Structure 1
Amino acid sequence: DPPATVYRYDSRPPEDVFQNGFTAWGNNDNVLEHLTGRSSQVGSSNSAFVSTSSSRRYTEVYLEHRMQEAVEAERAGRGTGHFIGYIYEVRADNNFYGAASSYFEYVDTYGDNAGRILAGALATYQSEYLAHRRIPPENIRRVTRVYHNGITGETTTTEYSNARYVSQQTRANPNPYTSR
C-alpha cells in the first residue's frame, strides 16, 4: 500500500512547524519543475509542493550533507561550523502523492522523451512523496533535532512529540498528482 509515514528534513524548528505545519512556497503547480529542482528555495521559490520521503534514511543523508557543508565552511574560515537540522516524521494522507507516478503521468502527457522511457525504479524519485500546498500540523507526529557544535565537533540528537498530532488511519494517495 502507499506509505502511512513519510519524513522531511527542514531547517525550521518545531515551535513553527508543530503549530503551523508546512506551507508550500507558492502557487507553481508544475510537478516537473518541482521534482527537477527548479521551483524550491534555490530556484524560483514558488512551488506548490512540499517534498517528503518514505525513506527516513533519505532525509538523514540530506541532514548529514547540510551539516558537512557547515563543517567545510568552518575549515575554510567562512563560519563557526555550528549546525541545527530537523527531521520531521509525518502521517501521509490523500493530499500526498507519489513523486514517481506523478512524474511519469506528467512527462507521458506533456514531456518530450528525455528521461521518460529510460527511467528505472531506483532512478526515478524512488521514495519521494509530494504534499500538495500544505502539510497540516495535525499530520506532524514528531521531530528529531541534530545539533553540531562547530568548535568541539560534538553532535547531539534530541526528539520531541507534537501535542497537536492527530492519529488517524490515512495513507498517501494511490494515484498520480494531476493539476486541475
Structure 2
Amino acid sequence: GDPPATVYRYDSRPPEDVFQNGFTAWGNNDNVLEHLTGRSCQVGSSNSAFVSTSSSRRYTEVYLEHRMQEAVEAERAGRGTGHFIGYIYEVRADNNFYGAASSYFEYVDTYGDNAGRILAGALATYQSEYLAHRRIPPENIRRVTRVYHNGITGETTTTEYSNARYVSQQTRANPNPYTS
C-alpha cells in the first residue's frame, strides 16, 4: 500500500531531449483541478505546473496505442501519412510526485462546487495518476520504450533504451496530497 516508487509517462518527445533534460512543466499554473481536466495542458492553456505520470504502465500503453490508432485513422480519412513514433518513459518517483486522486479531493473539498465531488469512486477518479510538480529531473528517468508504426507497410517496432544519467536511490511518491 506504500506510494509507488515507479511511474510511467507517455510523451511524444525523444530521449535525446528527455534523458538529458528531464521533463519541465508547461508553466506556473498549479491549479490541480485545471490540470486533471486537461484545461492547463497542451490542448488547453499550456501552463500547468505538473508533469503527468501513472503508476499503471497499462494506462500509458493505452495512451500510446490510442495516439497510434488516431494517426492511422487520419490516413483512412486521407489527411495523414500513417507513421507514428511514441515513447513511454519509466520514472522513479520522489516526494515531488503527488497522487492525483488525493490531490483532486483535497482541492475540491476545500474550493470546489458539487460536481464530481461526492459521487466519485476510486476507478473513476484519476485512479493511478501521479503529478510531478515543476520538473521530473533527468536523474529520475530510468528508461524509455519507443514504439514506431510504419503506416505504409503496417509494421510496428518496439525498442528500449536506458538512461546513463539515471541515479538509483531510495525514493517514492509523496504520501500526502499536493497543496499550494
Q: What range is the shorter-chain TM-score in?
A: over 0.9
Shift of 1:76: 1.2
Q: Distance in 2 between matches of 1:115 and 1:79?
A: 37
Shift of 1:34: 0.1
Please identify runs of 4+ aligned residues in structure 1 that moved more than 6 A: none
1:132-162 Cα offsets, whole Å, 9 max, x none, are: 0000000000000000001000000000000
CA-based RMSD = 0.4
Q: Distance in 2 between matches of 1:118 and 1:30?
A: 21
Q: Distance in 2 between matches of 1:123 and 1:58?
A: 13
1:46-75 Cα offsets, whole Å, 9 max, x none, are: 000000000000000000000001100111
Q: Distance in 2 between matches of 1:67 and 1:123?
A: 24
TM-score by length of 2: 0.99
Query: Residue 62 of structure 1 aligns to a residue in which SS?
Result: helix
Query: Residue 87 of structure 1 aligns to a residue in which SS?
Result: strand
Number of residue pairs matched by the alignment: 179
Q: Distance in 2 between matches of 1:76 and 1:108?
A: 44
Q: Distance in 2 between matches of 1:51 and 1:65?
A: 17
Q: Distance in 2 between matches of 1:136 and 1:94?
A: 13
TM-score by length of 1: 0.99
1:70-100 Cα offsets, whole Å, 9 max, x none, are: 1001111111100000000000000000000
Q: Distance in 2 between matches of 1:69 and 1:107?
A: 33
Q: Distance in 1 between matches of 2:57 and 2:164?
A: 22
Work out the percentage of aligned pairs sharing the same amino acid. 99
Q: Structure 1: 5+ residue runs without aligned partners?
A: none
